[PDB]
Design a binder for this molecule. Structure first.
Ligand SMILES: COc1ncnc(OC)c1C(=O)Nc1nc(C(F)(F)F)c(-c2ccnc(C(C)(C)C#N)c2)s1
Ligand SMILES: COc1ncnc(OC)c1C(=O)Nc1nc(C(F)(F)F)c(-c2ccnc(C(C)(C)C#N)c2)s1
Ligand SMILES: COc1ncnc(OC)c1C(=O)Nc1nc(C(F)(F)F)c(-c2ccnc(C(C)(C)C#N)c2)s1
Ligand SMILES: COc1ncnc(OC)c1C(=O)Nc1nc(C(F)(F)F)c(-c2ccnc(C(C)(C)C#N)c2)s1
Lengths: 606, 71
């Protein structure tokens, strides 16, 4: 019954004399060996020691308590496996006393425990420290350096990096090093006061080298690609436009002013893992990832915006206009073949271009959220399928080819939207590709089918069997359902004469149906409109920019290797002793930050 | 009505939960009866409900306990 007494005296901390006398009693019991001492010094249910319980419960007399505990542990030559002890429970496995000393913002006791020989690579490899998803657990990086940097303790981060045995390049279970962890924890614009940016810069400069940033976690992502995968716009803006002005760490920068004269300044940005020449770059990840809902702000960053503009103005404008022209003439030929259908010059350019579109969009689908971005692939493929099916049915002796041919013509004129999404007149279609297709139309369809079936039964039931037009178009259940459908389609007519024993109840239910379907339609209407015209114009412009970037990257994938190498955004530039990294030049004019220009690669501007 | 929807849903759900709990037999209620006994003081022994919350906008430090060992 001494374990519980030691734990209570160490957690309550009301007096260190209690734990001193209890430790005297424990040493007396020990004289009559190390495994016994620490099995009486730990809690077998979790593996926690009295040191963790002392640090988990900080009180005005806890520094003296940990001093007493460490003195008693060193006076028995057990302090090695006592200060390095760790939990054993599945949830908090691997957590040691240094993790608890740092998580409690106790810097003095942390220095004490590192001086006593607590290994500083203790990985908190538990299911609480490596949560399946955030908000259920606390992921900081599974390491005392990551825990000191994530909890905003730069004093402890300096104390940890100035140590000798620290592993700055240590990678946790998730594959993350300190920088992936900092990217993961980084929150927002003004939520965490951008302290994670400070820790990122400090840890990267302390260990001035490119190994922390070129290290791939288990998802094959570097800290930069990991900031691209998530929606860390601030950390991405920092890493991308990062200018170190120290003389020794200048090669760590990703942006280099080389040109400033007055307000004019031409700066280079680095495009190594950014310009779609590699496996998956910041550009690819930022454009194609549909899981952040922040591409509006990440595609306007310093190198990415101009990279997209340059790709566009260089080849993507031409490829896009050429494909729009080809599809327009395809649709005109389809329209003239559908109008002059044989109820002759070329009716196969339609067919060859339809087969080309079908195979292209089919290969595009085969390599894959997928109804908003990759929507037009399906409709272009369906249109091409309809065209080739119309041709096959026409050369066979089928008179059912006209339906597919006219449907294909109409669907092609509809697919003409993909080219005109940013024209301020096809705005509502471009945005209701996103709004109405999600769930409101399916909710509407469910409620409308319920209305239709219920009122069809209610109205067909009210009608009397009559000798064979029956005086009633609401006869069987199917005729009532058809009349109701035609009604909501503005194709019918309501008459007070329907051969019912209760004509007033029939009229009541009919008008009730009319009004309820109108309410449904108008809910869907105000949903599809949702004007806030400023915000809907933001939405249309944002959709146009996102699809513009997406099609720029699509078009860059179609070119051969030699044409891609001939476009090849980025001029080769020497930025250090021997660095020679491909950069992208951006000129700016700032009339506010007046500074003497001491960082530059060229002294003669121009 | 965007929020009024959540208001009305929450009120209807609370009333439904309470009337359902009233409909059950006393032994069934005694079976469900969330909340577990917990010693709080010398002799307090109150029915406490454990609530593990995660406020990921935290900037503070905690040092207190009843069972410092994380459950
Ligand atoms: C720029 O648009 C055009 N310009 C000139 N001519 C055109 O057609 C001749 C067009 C055009 O959009 N045509 C279309 N064809 C079809 C197809 F069903 F056949 F696929 C369309 C379609 C598809 C799916 N759901 C609907 C709704 C929900 C509205 C219903 N009901 C309509 S729409
Ligand atoms: C999901 O809805 C359905 N699904 C399948 N079948 C259905 O009916 C066959 C229905 C349906 O709504 N039925 C209805 N019954 C009645 C009633 F006569 F009982 F009052 C309706 C009614 C009539 C007049 N004023 C109102 C209010 C006060 C709301 C207004 N304004 C409601 S509506
Ligand atoms: C008793 O009538 C109803 N009861 C309950 N609900 C209803 O609608 C939900 C309705 C109803 O009339 N519905 C309609 N549907 C359509 C259609 F667009 F499909 F053609 C309608 C139509 C038809 C012809 N010209 C137009 C113009 C050019 C004026 C437009 N715009 C609209 S009208
Ligand atoms: C085919 O649709 C049209 N075509 C050309 N012109 C039109 O205007 C006359 C119309 C038209 O909407 N007629 C309508 N009459 C009525 C009725 F209230 F009388 F039932 C409508 C109705 C029904 C249910 N809930 C509403 C709400 C509350 C949303 C509103 N507001 C309105 S709708």
């Amino acid at each position: 019954r001494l374990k519980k007494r030691i734990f209570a005296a160490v957690s309550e901390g009301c007096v260190e004399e209690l734990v001193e006398l209890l430790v005297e009693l424990q040493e007396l019991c020990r004289r009559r060996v190390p495994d016994f001492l620490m099995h009486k010094l730990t809690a077998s249910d979790t593996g926690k020691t009295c040191l963790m319980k002392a640090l988990l419960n900080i009180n005005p007399n806890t520094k003296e308590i940990v001093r007493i505990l460490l003195a008693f542990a060193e006076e028995n030559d057990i302090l090695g496996r006592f200060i390095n002890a760790e939990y054993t429970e599945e949830a908090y496995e691997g957590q040691t006393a240094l993790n608890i000393a740092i998580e409690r913002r106790q810097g003095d006791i942390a220095a004490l425990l590192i001086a006593a020989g607590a290994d500083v690579n203790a990985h908190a490899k538990g299911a609480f420290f490596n949560p399946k998803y955030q908000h259920e657990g606390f992921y900081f990086g599974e390491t005392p350096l990551a825990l000191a940097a994530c909890t905003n303790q730069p004093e402890i981060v300096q104390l940890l990096m100035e140590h000798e045995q620290t592993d700055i390049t240590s990678r946790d279970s998730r594959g993350n090093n300190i920088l992936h962890a900092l990217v993961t924890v980084a929150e927002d614009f003004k939520t965490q006061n951008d302290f994670v940016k400070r820790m990122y810069d400090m840890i990267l400069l302390r260990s001035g080298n490119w190994e922390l940033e070129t290290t791939r976690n288990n998802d094959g992502l570097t800290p930069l690609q990991l900031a691209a995968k998530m929606g860390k716009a601030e950390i991405l803006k920092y890493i991308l436009s990062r200018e170190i002005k120290e003389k020794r760490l200048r090669s760590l920068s990703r942006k280099f002013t080389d040109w400033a004269y007055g307000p004019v300044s031409s700066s280079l940005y680095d495009l190594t893992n950014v310009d779609t020449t590699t496996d998956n770059s910041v550009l690819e990840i930022t454009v194609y990832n549909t899981n952040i809902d922040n591409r509006h702000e990440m595609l306007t960053l310093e190198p990415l915006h101009t990279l997209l503009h340059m790709k566009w103005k260089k080849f993507a404008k031409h490829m896009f206009f050429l494909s729009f022209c080809f599809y327009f003439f395809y649709n005109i030929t389809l329209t003239l073949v559908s109008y002059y259908r044989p109820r002759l010059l070329g009716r196969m350019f339609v067919l060859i271009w339809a087969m080309c579109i079908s195979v292209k969009e089919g290969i595009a689908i085969f390599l894959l959220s997928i109804l908003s971005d990759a929507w037009f692939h399906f409709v272009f493929f369906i249109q091409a399928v309809l065209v080739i099916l119309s041709v096959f049915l026409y050369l066979f002796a089928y008179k059912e080819y006209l339906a597919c041919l006219v449907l294909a013509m109409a669907l092609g004129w509809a697919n003409m939207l993909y080219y005109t999404r940013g024209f301020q007149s096809m705005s509502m279609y471009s945005v209701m590709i996103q709004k109405v297709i999600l769930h409101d139309v399916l909710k509407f369809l469910f409620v409308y089918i319920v209305f239709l079936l219920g009122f069809g039964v209610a109205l067909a039931s009210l009608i009397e069997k009559c000798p064979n037009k029956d005086c009633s178009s609401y006869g069987s259940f199917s005729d009532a359902v058809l009349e109701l459908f035609k009604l909501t389609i503005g194709l019918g007519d309501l008459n007070i004469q329907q051969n019912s024993k209760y004509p007033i109840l029939f009229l009541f239910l009919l008008i009730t149906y009319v009004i309820l379907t109108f309410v449904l339609l108008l809910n869907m209407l105000i949903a599809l409109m949702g004007e806030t015209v400023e915000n809907v114009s933001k939405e249309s412009e944002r959709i146009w920019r996102l699809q513009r970037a997406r099609t720029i990257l699509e078009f860059e994938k179609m070119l051969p290797e030699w044409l891609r190498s001939r476009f090849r955004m980025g001029e080769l530039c020497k930025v250090a002793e021997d660095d020679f990294r491909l950069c992208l030049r951006i000129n700016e004019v700032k009339w506010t930050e007046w500074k003497t220009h001491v960082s530059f690669l060229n002294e003669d501007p121009g």
